[PDB]
Design a protein around this ligand. Structure first.
Ligand SMILES: [Zn+2]
Length: 258
């Protein structure tokens, strides 16, 4: 009876195994754009992905992860609210069964069709497992997806999904350039939060871009053909793998822009 996104093991159940689910800095949250404070002390974000080395794509039963070589400073996030250097380890998405839902963060209660998470860890902690135990261990760059025109840079991802339909399947995925998934503007909101899947650890500096990327209906439809289940198990479509907004509590969301 592992955690998941179903009726009997979904987000409202997670707290039983993971009490931090009801903690003080849980994610995602609603971003109230009128209450977010412009912060002039924020530096411009630095996304250096030119030397990124993608390795593999994995269906892990709750999403698919595009994994990167993080044994060197190759694809790094710096600046903005961050002190030091954070290395890209993987990216993944959350999406809905319908275009009107799927994102984890919301903007003035608006849900997007999906949300991309580029997950980075603080190099001062040596590796990902140590980093998740620190309050400043991770930096996750969140990017909203809306349905409209296709995103050409996403197509290589969509086309390999057939080969990893079910839980536990992986495929070689080299030479993928994550720069093709970024919107034009790097304007962002930022706040301290958590992983949005168990273990829900409170180790994340969230950086959520204001500008969504557009993907096509055909692209998101292919996300929705994935399976939560393993091969030879009853088919359950991998859809609605998002956690809803959690209480902001004692936090202020800061904006890099006015
Ligand atoms: Zn995520």
């Amino acid at each position: 009876h592992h955690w998941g996104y179903g009726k009997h093991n979904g987000p409202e159940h997670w707290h039983k195994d993971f009490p931090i689910a009801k903690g003080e800095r849980q994610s995602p949250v609603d971003i109230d754009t009128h209450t977010a404070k412009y912060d002039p002390s924020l530096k411009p974000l630095s996304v250096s992905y030119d030397q990124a080395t993608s390795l593999r794509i994995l269906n892990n039963g709750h999403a698919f992860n595009v994994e990167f070589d993080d044994s060197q400073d190759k694809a790094v996030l710096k600046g903005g609210p961050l002190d030091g250097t954070y290395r890209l380890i993987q990216f993944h998405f959350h999406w809905g069964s319908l275009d009107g839902q799927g994102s984890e963060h919301t903007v003035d209660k608006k849900k997007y069709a999906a949300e991309l998470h580029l997950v980075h860890w603080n190099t001062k902690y040596g590796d990902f497992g140590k980093a998740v135990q620190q309050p400043d261990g991770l930096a996750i760059l969140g990017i909203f997806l809306k349905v409209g025109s296709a995103k050409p840079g996403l197509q290589k991802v969509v086309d390999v999904l057939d080969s990893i339909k079910t839980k536990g399947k992986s495929a070689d995925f080299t030479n993928f350039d994550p720069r093709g998934l970024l919107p034009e503007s790097l304007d962002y909101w930022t706040y301290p939060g958590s992983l949005t899947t168990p273990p829900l650890l409170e180790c994340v500096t969230w950086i959520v871009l204001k500008e969504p990327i557009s993907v096509s209906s055909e692209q998101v439809l292919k996300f929705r053909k994935l399976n939560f289940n393993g091969e030879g198990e009853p088919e359950e479509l991998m859809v609605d793998n998002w956690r809803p907004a959690q209480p902001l509590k004692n936090r202020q969301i800061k904006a890099s822009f006015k």
